Design a protein around this ligand. Structure first.
Ligand SMILES: *[C@@H]1O[C@H](CO)[C@@H](O)[C@H](O)[C@H]1NC(C)=O
Ligand SMILES: *[C@@H]1O[C@H](CO)[C@@H](O)[C@H](O)[C@H]1NC(C)=O
Length: 1406
């Protein structure tokens, strides 16, 4: 009677009774339940949330806020609420003093309500003090209080409306005004007050809105709506992204990880420190909220099927009051909304934690790379140290979203199995077995398609390299007329790729069959066992449609669990890698005693006493007991035998090498120039200043003194000229010169130079020695350590040190070492001896597949979905069957028809997948054949104007995404779209008012994809573009760690790395928030759809059949996942289909003349005799430029040897290009053997003359293929050419006599042998006309002597119309035609040209 007497002294009003609360046409809570629970639940929530929230606020202060009107009103309303709450308490005390007996509840509930109201006021004050603008706890507390007070208000209004019930006017009016105040407090809690007075973000012009967004705007992610609208209205660039939150900046994230790791390493000082412990301690506090939210979402997920069971029971029962269904549908909608909010908060927390982990790891790795010892860095390679940011920190980034799965997915699986066992008996095993047996099948198939993928990509790389080689040699290919052979070879390689693609297509067909038809298979197995095991097993709507809704939510934790565990093991290997790197021994800072230049301890800037060093503890010491001192300002030299240890003394003095024993000290700033130059990917000028103020006078002085002024003239922009990506054109001497210039401009005290002169010749060498470093140099009043192998500059230098195998042989001035003649005696003697993609792109891709295959695929897909819909409707009918004599009739027929429909769906799914995949390979074949033909038919002009990068990208990446990506996107997009359509048609067929709700909610509010699609695509682009520079900077800083450490520039580079990481996160964060935004909106659409389906089912409960209701609600439960899939796949289609537009881009660019036109085929005159003819010819590179060739008229019979002579840009190479009409003759004409070659199809003539460039290119393949791709000539002719190429003996000396594969461009042969092979090809093709365009100056006087003697013996008969600037080889030619100014000067035999002392003789004298 504890609860019963607590109601009243007589215990008349019961605490809970279905008599009034549930089994009645008008529900209402009994007065005890109101006055106890409806007032204890909000008090309980506030008092349980205060401890944790106060602990969090004490650990999280955002400053201070003024007392504005809003907060003053909220405090005043809180105090008024407490006094009005104690009003009824005082009334009850007065009544008890009056003698009237009253219950304990009236004397306990108001007390707790008043104290919790005062608590709310106090916590609102402390929230103001601690700087929170929109309270989350208060909003939910007020919402709970308003809901409970609303229930009590409805009860009280109903009771008062009774014309016989007693009314307690005092308590009624007190509760009325309490309700009004609570409602106004809730409406005020939605607002936000002024920003904190300590808002340091005032300087920041573009802060992240999340810092100052309301709680409602924060759970719905509304604050990114402006960004997503703008991203569709106009393009988004990096200038528009918001600044990061202070808690996300690397300057606030990296130090905590660094400090925690240092603390644990110190603790371990045995047992190796564990990076997992540090990462956990550092990032778990913000990650446990993820566990809480995930648990809440997992629990709320199962509230769907149970409420569906209740709704089905309500529809079947026709004696239950109508409001029960409305209660159920409201409950379902509320649960779905809460679940979506909680899940997306969980995802946000996980993603932000991953972002922070990535930032911290990148920063810690960067800061460690600058202090790792030389042995540690030399253990690994720079490409593997960079991978610590490239892959090893992205794995931690992505695992944060999957780590929680390891406990959530088993929980979901066990809950689903338990509910299935409760709902449908042990026959659930028949479906869980099919689902568990499915995952080994798809894992095996994934491996079997991974092997096919790698096998196809390895075969595709052959074509890709063949492309990268052929386009590089397009001119010679066009010039020989060999394009058909290479077209055929590429086509064969494409055929191999397409076979592999067909096999992968079969695999993908079976895979999508499994993925689509697994739920039907599970349902069939379960229902078959359940109904066949026992006759009394009756399939009802709550057994079938509750089981399916639970099978769907058991599907996901099983299908994604193997991926999660694989990701965990990969992250384990990642963490071991990072732990090994971060545990490396670091340089001992105090081994090198640095002291300020102001110290007057002694007049020597460098001192050393018995110092020995080594690059590793175990390795033997290199420098042995050196002891020397360098007086301040002296110019000291260290010269000795190479490899004897002179080149390591500077590095030892820079603290690079471990100091085993000794005592050395260096004063002042240190400037260092290493032997291997370090150059950044920035402008030459910025590289020279190395981050200092530009003093124009001093900068000019150092650049002119360092002899850089002639160098900046060659490159376009001068000092402003950016070095580009890793030295666009900088040579070794240029690199050393700019490094030295940076060293001088730094203006340090001691200068350690590791032979900056080595890669520089003597002339400008001695120039810079005199101007910058020597006794007359720029820094002649500084301390300089020189290690160099030069002799002539040694005498000027003050005191000289000679090394011997890591020991100090002797030191002194140069006169003294002349006198004693010690080590330097031998040294001188021996050593010195956009918008939306057009629909026409989709249409032309559909044509590329084939309209027949496309129609077949669409027909099969529609058949699949009609089969599935009819199957679900048939299941509904089966569950609608009656119970007669304890058993259901028609059981066998229902089961058989269900099975038949399912197998029809399965075979149809398999068919449509195979059809679309085969059509995809068909399209991939035709598109590539067309692209190749169009490119190979285009003129050379298009080849020079279009950078080769675009063509290789078009052939590799666009073709790859067309072959592999888009056919699968078609699968998934069609699946999602028609799943959504099927759900909608089911819903609106069961209840046609769904047709009313769908327009104002489906189409209109589904234009939220118009913004996400436009904006996320831009944001991911920015993310990748900003992701690359972080790794670029890490590599660039790893290359030059010693230089940075010498100049004391560690802070600058750490700050730059921080900026690069922050710029990448600036684009990464909006992408995550955008995903959350779209997910919230789409799941809101789905929740509303399920609400309306259930609500119209409740309205039409008297006409629906209790099986249609379950079907509609079950499909509505899936609508949300289908919508998310559809939007994501629509975006992934839009951003990826443009590859088809790109692959057909050159389908209309102007092509060459018709290759082979057979209407006027010529006779077999051939060029043999070597005739040359021109009739007022004229050619020009591009018609807007100047005519390089003007009015050439000549007609000479064959059998002659004429060379062509001219000055720079005279018209020689243009004539060579115009010989084979490779450029269309604007004016004039050329006729050979009475054939107008300017008209006939160029293939019909290009094979019937010959030409060879300066360096004729070879190809990756057999020497037989290079000599003849058609291989029509007999191998005896091959050997003929080889002997006339002076190679038969050498070629036979190769392992393969005739088919020895030759590398690209003749790499398998030396450059001299390469030109020998080019001569070999030239002769081998049975040729007449040959040319050496500038080749005379690039070939040594022995091999070109061979080629000349061949023109005397082999091309004695052949006609050579060449251009040799070293025409001394061709003076013996019968005649020479001299041309200049783009026109013919004169002609004749070389004799009278010599005697006339003319222009030709003027170049002859040169
Ligand atoms: C609900 O209340 C009374 C209380 O005894 C119960 O006997 C009866 O079944 C119900 N009476 C109504 C609805 O009048
Ligand atoms: C529920 O309400 C009906 C109608 O008043 C009544 O006949 C029935 O006895 C009640 N059944 C239960 C279990 O409360």
């Amino acid at each position: 009677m504890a609860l019963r007497d607590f109601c009243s002294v007589d215990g008349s009003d019961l605490f809970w009774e279905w008599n009034v609360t549930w089994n009645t046409s008008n529900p209402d809570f009994t007065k005890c339940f109101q006055n106890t629970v409806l007032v204890w639940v909000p008090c309980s929530y506030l008092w349980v949330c205060f401890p944790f929230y106060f602990l969090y606020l004490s650990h999280h202060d955002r400053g201070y806020i003024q007392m504005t009107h809003l907060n003053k009103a909220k405090t005043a309303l809180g105090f008024l609420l407490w006094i009005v709450c104690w009003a009824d308490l005082f009334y009850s005390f007065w009544e008890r003093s009056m003698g009237k007996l009253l219950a304990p509840v009236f004397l306990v509930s108001p007390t707790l309500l008043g104290i919790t109201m005062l608590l709310a006021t106090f916590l609102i004050q402390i929230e103001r003090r601690r700087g929170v603008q929109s309270s989350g706890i208060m909003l939910t507390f007020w919402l709970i209080a308003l809901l409970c007070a609303l229930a009590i208000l409805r009860s009280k209004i109903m009771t008062a409306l009774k014309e016989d019930a007693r009314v307690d006017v005092f308590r009624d009016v007190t509760f009325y005004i309490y309700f009004s105040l609570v409602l106004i407090q809730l409406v005020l809690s939605c607002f936000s007050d002024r920003s904190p007075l300590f808002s340091e973000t005032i300087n920041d012009p573009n802060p992240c809105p999340e810092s100052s967004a309301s709680f409602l705007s924060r759970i719905t992610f509304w604050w990114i709506t402006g960004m997503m609208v703008q991203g569709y209205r106009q393009p988004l660039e990096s200038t528009d992204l918001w600044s990061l939150n202070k808690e996300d900046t690397s300057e606030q994230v990296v130090p905590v990880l660094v400090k925690n790791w240092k603390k644990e390493c110190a603790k371990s000082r045995e047992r190796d420190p564990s990076l997992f412990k540090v990462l956990y301690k550092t990032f778990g506090p913000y990650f446990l909220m993820s566990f809480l939210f995930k648990a809440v979402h997992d629990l709320m997920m199962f509230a769907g099927p149970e409420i569906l069971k209740l709704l089905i029971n309500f529809v079947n029962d026709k004696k239950a009051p109508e409001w029960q269904g409305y209660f159920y549908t409201a409950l379902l909608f509320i649960s779905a909304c809460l679940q979506t909010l909680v899940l997306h908060q969980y995802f946000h927390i996980c993603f932000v934690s991953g972002m922070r982990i990535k930032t911290a790891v990148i920063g810690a790795v960067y800061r460690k790379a600058l202090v790792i010892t030389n042995a540690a860095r030399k253990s690994s390679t720079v490409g593997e140290i960079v991978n610590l940011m490239s892959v090893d920190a992205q794995r931690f980034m992505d695992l944060a979203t999957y780590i929680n799965m390891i406990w959530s997915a088993p929980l979901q699986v066990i809950l689903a199995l338990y509910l299935l066992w409760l709902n449908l008996g042990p026959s659930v095993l028949a479906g869980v077995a099919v689902m568990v047996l499915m995952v080994p099948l798809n894992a095996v198939m994934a491996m079997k398609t991974k092997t096919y993928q790698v096998a196809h990509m390895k075969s595709k790389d052959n074509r890709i390299k063949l492309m990268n080689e052929i386009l590089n040699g397009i001119k010679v290919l066009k010039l020989y007329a060999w394009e058909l052979a290479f077209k055929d070879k590429v086509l064969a390689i494409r055929q191999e790729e397409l076979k592999v693609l067909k096999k992968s297509a079969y695999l993908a067909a079976v895979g999508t069959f499994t993925w689509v038809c697994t739920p039907f298979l599970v349902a069939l197995s379960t229902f078959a066992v359940y109904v066949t095991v026992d006759e009394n097993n009756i399939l009802d709507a709550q057994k079938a449609f509750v089981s399916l809704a639970l099978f769907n939510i058991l599907r996901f934790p099983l299908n994604i669990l193997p991926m999660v565990i694989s990701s965990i093991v990969q992250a384990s290997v990642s963490l071991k890698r990072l732990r090994v790197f971060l545990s490396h021994e670091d340089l001992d800072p105090d081994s090198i005693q640095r002291r300020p230049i102001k110290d007057a301890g002694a007049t020597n800037s460098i001192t050393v006493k018995n110092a020995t060093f080594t690059w590793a503890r175990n390795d033997p010491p290199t420098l042995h007991g050196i002891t020397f001192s360098v007086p301040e300002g002296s110019l000291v030299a260290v010269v000795g035998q190479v490899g004897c240890g002179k080149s390591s003394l500077l590095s030892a003095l820079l603290a690079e090498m471990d100091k085993v024993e000794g005592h050395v000290t260096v004063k002042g700033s240190v400037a260092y120039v290493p032997q291997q130059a370090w150059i950044q990917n920035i402008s030459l000028r910025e590289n020279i200043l190395f981050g200092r103020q530009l003093q124009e006078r001093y900068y000019k002085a150092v650049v002119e003194a360092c002899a850089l002024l002639p160098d900046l003239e060659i490159l376009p922009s001068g000092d402003r000229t950016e070095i580009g990506e890793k030295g666009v054109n900088l040579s070794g001497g240029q690199k050393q010169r700019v490094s030295l210039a940076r060293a001088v401009y730094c203006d340090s005290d001691v200068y350690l130079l590791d032979d900056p002169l080595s890669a520089v010749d003597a002339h400008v060498g001695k120039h810079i020695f005199e101007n910058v470093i020597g006794p007359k140099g720029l820094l002649k009043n500084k301390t300089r350590l020189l290690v160099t192998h030069a002799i002539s500059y040694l005498p000027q230098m003050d005191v000289i040190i000679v090394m011997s195998g890591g020991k100090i042989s002797e030191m002194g001035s140069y006169q003294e070492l002349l006198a004693r003649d010690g080590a330097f005696a031998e040294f001188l003697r021996t050593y010195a001896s956009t918008g939306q993609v057009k629909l026409s792109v989709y249409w032309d891709y559909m044509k590329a597949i084939g309209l027949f295959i496309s129609f077949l695929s669409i027909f099969l897909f529609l058949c699949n979905h009609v089969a599935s819909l009819v199957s679900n409707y048939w299941l509904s009918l089966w569950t609608d069957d009656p119970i007669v004599n304890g058993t259901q009739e028609h059981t066998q027929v229902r089961l058989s028809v269900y099975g038949a429909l399912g197998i029809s769906q399965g075979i149809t799914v398999f068919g449509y997948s195979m059809a679309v995949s085969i059509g995809g390979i068909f399209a991939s074949r035709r598109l590539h054949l067309d692209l190749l033909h169009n490119v190979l038919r285009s003129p050379i002009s298009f080849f020079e104007r279009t950078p080769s990068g675009n063509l290789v990208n078009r052939f590799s990446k666009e073709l790859d995404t067309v072959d592999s990506m888009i056919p699968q996107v078609i699968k998934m997009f069609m699946g999602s779209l028609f799943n959504v359509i099927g759900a909608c048609i089911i819903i609106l067929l069961a209840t046609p008012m769904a047709a009313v709700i769908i327009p104002p909610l489906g189409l209109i509010y589904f234009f939220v994809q118009r913004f996400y699609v436009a904006s996320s695509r831009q944001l991911k682009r920015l993310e990748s573009v900003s992701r690359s520079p972080v790794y670029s900077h890490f590599n660039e800083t790893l290359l030059g760690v010693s230089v940075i450490r010498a100049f004391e520039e560690q802070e600058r580079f750490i700050r730059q790395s921080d900026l690069k990481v922050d710029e990448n996160q600036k684009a990464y964060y909006p992408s995550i928030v955008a995903n959350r935004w779209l997910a919230v909106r789409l799941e809101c659409v789905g929740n509303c759809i399920v609400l309306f389906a259930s609500l119209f089912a409740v309205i039409s409960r008297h006409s629906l059949s209790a099986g249609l209701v379950g079907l509609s609600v079950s499909y509505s439960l899936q609508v949300t996942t289908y919508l998310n899939w559809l939007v994501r796949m629509s975006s992934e289609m839009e951003t990826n289909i443009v590859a088809v537009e790109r692959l057909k881009e050159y389908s209309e660019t102007e092509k060459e003349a018709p290759w082979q036109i057979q209407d006027m085929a010529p006779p077999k005159d051939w060029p043999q005799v070597g005739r040359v003819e021109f009739r007022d010819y004229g050619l020009r590179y591009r018609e807007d430029l100047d005519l390089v060739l003007k009015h050439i008229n000549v007609t000479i019979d064959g059998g002659e040897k004429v060379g062509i002579v001219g000055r720079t840009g005279a018209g020689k190479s243009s004539l060579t290009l115009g010989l084979f009409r490779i450029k269309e003759s604007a004016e004039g004409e050329i006729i050979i053997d009475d054939i107008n070659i300017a008209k006939i199809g160029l293939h019909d003539l290009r094979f019937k003359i010959t030409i060879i460039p300066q360096d004729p290119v070879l190809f990756s393949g057999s020497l037989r293929m290079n000599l003849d791709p058609f291989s029509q000539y007999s191998d005896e002719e091959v050997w003929t050419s080889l002997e006339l190429a002076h190679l038969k003996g050498f070629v036979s000396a190769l392992p393969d006599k005739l088919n020895h594969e030759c590398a690209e461009g003749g790499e398998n042969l030396s450059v001299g042998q390469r030109q020998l092979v080019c001569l070999a090809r030239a002769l081998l093709r049975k040729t007449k006309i040959l040319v050496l365009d500038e080749a005379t100056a690039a070939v040594d006087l022995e091999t070109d002597d061979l080629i000349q003697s061949t023109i005397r013996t082999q091309f004695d008969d052949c006609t050579v119309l060449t251009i040799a600037h070293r025409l001394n080889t061709i003076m013996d030619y019968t005649r020479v035609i001299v041309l200049d100014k783009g026109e013919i000067q004169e002609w004749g035999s070389p004799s009278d040209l010599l005697q006339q002392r003319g222009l030709f003789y003027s170049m002859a004298k040169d």
